[PDB]
């Protein structure tokens, strides 16, 4: 609805799950697809194969509301962050800006411990 067609996508991908969400210019949220939401569970959500079809099921419900141009907000250092963008162009959008905004601190707090395994 209202056919803005100038959206902002969002990319977040840990070592164990990924979420893509496509919003407005600012953006207020429109449609989002998660690797857990597409039937996958547990540990297999880490793989880059989910990042294709999560992006596809995001873009379908996205451009039902009418969507041509897009911004690419990249958080979440994981695995399929590049596959999500490459399948994002494969369903016909206007990726032209790559910002891998990874929030790094300046030694504020302390990390958790090692994993004595």
């Amino acid at each position: 609805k209202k056919n803005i067609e100038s959206g902002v996508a969002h990319i977040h991908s840990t070592f164990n799950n990924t979420i893509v969400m496509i919003t407005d210019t600012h953006g207020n949220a429109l449609a989002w697809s998660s690797a857990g939401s597409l039937g996958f569970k547990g540990s297999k959500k880490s793989t880059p194969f989910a990042a294709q079809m999560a992006a596809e099921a995001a873009t379908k419900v996205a451009m039902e509301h009418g969507l041509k141009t897009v911004d690419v907000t990249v958080k979440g250092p994981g695995s399929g962050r590049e596959a999500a963008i490459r399948s994002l162009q494969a369903t016909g959008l206007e990726v032209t800006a790559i910002r891998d905004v990874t929030p790094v601190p300046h030694n504020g707090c302390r990390p958790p411990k090692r994993r004595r395994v």
Partner: protein
């Protein structure tokens, strides 16, 4: 294997059709070297093509080489143990291997109640865009660039 490469033993053509790859299609259904049943009913099935929607068996064999042709192939080459592969460029050796294995092991999957009408409809399918072996070429086109999510760090 481990030491180095090895030969491939290319097949001789037929003294009847005069075509090499027809012999490659012969030598995948034939069990225990029984050329008498299996190869002759393959002759009968291509003559069924010649009698219904066909003129010469060599040209329609080339038409089957069209519509079954494996254009790509993957091979599971792990590094750290995980599911790692890439759509590799297929050798025309291994192209013929994959395509004729699709045709023969779908003639296994077909299983029609006449021992050569399964072969007749099998090659009417593999020569004329139909049957699930041509749809196996479709599904081979499918996973080509669909396991590419983990095949671009190469």
């Amino acid at each position: 294997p481990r030491k180095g490469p090895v030969a491939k033993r290319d097949v001789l053509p037929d003294p009847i059709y005069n075509s090499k790859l027809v012999t490659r299609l012969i030598n995948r259904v034939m069990v225990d070297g029984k050329r008498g049943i299996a190869a002759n009913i393959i002759y009968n099935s291509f003559d069924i093509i010649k009698e219904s929607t066909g003129n010469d068996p060599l040209e329609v064999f080339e038409q089957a080489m069209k519509n079954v042709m494996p254009v790509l192939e993957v091979k599971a080459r792990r590094v750290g143990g995980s599911n790692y592969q890439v759509p590799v460029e297929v050798r025309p050796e291994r192209r013929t291997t994959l395509g004729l294995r699709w045709v023969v092991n779908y003639a296994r999957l077909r299983g029609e109640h006449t021992m050569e009408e399964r072969l007749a409809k099998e090659i009417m399918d593999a020569a004329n865009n139909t049957g699930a072996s041509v749809k196996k070429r479709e599904d081979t086109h499918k996973m080509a660039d669909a396991n590419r999510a983990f095949a671009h760090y190469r």
